[PDB]
């Protein structure tokens, strides 16, 4: 019934807000830090550090300022939250790759503008 390839979402996830891998990583690291403090509290769940390591391995933006720059760059274009988050997470390099990975971007933006956005993403990608 659901298909995000053409942006079919259930009614429950209409007011939902997406997050980056790096945003989730930094939030989970802060929560782990407060878990280190605030004694008389047991360790968190297996899913907690599982997702923490998963999003730390696939982290692409090492700076919170980089996060803010990416959001202030991407929010003002007419993109859906899912498309924007997927573009900022997968980080494609060619407009054909961006359109193939996200088939809901067909005609939303011009392929030259889409390639310029991808080039901006690659410019602000924190390399390792």
């Amino acid at each position: 019934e659901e298909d995000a390839s053409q942006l079919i979402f259930p009614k429950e996830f209409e007011t939902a807000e997406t997050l980056l891998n790096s945003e989730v990583h930094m939030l989970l690291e802060h929560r782990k830090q407060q878990n280190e403090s605030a004694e008389d509290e047991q360790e968190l769940s297996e899913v907690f550090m599982k997702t923490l390591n998963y999003t730390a391995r696939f982290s692409r933006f090492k700076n919170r300022e980089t996060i803010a720059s990416v959001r202030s760059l991407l929010l003002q274009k007419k993109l859906h939250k899912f498309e924007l988050a997927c573009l900022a997470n997968l980080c494609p390099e060619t407009a054909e790759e961006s359109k193939a990975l996200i088939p809901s971007l067909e005609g939303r933006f011009e392929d030259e503008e889409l390639q310029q956005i991808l080039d901006d993403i690659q410019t602000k990608r924190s390399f390792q």
Binding site: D3, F13, L20, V24, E46, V47, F48, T51, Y54
Partner: protein
């Protein structure tokens, strides 16, 4: 997709654990009882961001505990149908492919794997590779998979991937 939503749950407090600080007890209860859980409607409850609202405590008539309706920001993830997601390969099998996405185990069976991407147990790591030995998907690799369907069992969800479509496989 990794989501930041607000969820409502009711926490139950026995009078034995009222104490001088009551709201911290409720915060610990919420931070324990939903964390690491999985729902068929909202997927994996990854983490609780911020406890937003604590409702009025309705004492259950006749029975002792009090009831707290609680609204809270929570980080969650639920698998979808039809999306390419990065994954870590955990095991390569002649029948399928054991992959991992955070806490979710994903099974990519070989019939849903293209004919060129064949299985070889002769290699020291049992792995998937082609005859040209260009794309070698083995243990602990970073790949992308096409989620076809998800199955929930015993309050957790596992999914099935595929590599039929283009640009699927090793990154």
């Amino acid at each position: 997709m990794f989501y930041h939503i607000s969820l409502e749950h009711e926490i139950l407090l026995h009078p034995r654990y009222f104490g001088p600080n009551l709201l911290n007890t409720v915060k610990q209860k919420l931070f324990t009882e939903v964390e690491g859980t999985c729902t068929g409607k909202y997927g994996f409850v990854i983490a609780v961001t911020t406890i937003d609202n604590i409702g009025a405590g309705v004492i259950q008539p006749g029975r002792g505990f009090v009831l707290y309706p609680v609204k809270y920001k929570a980080i969650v993830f639920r698998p979808f149908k039809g999306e390419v997601v990065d994954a870590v390969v955990t095991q390569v099998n002649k029948v399928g492919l054991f992959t991992e996405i955070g806490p979710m185990s994903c099974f990519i069976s070989r019939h849903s794997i293209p004919s060129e991407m064949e299985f070889d147990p002769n290699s020291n790591p049992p792995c998937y590779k082609t005859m040209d030995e260009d794309i070698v998907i083995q243990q602990d690799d970073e790949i992308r998979l096409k989620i076809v369907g998800t199955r929930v069992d015993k309050n957790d969800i596992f999914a099935i991937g595929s590599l039929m479509d283009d640009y699927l496989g090793l990154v």
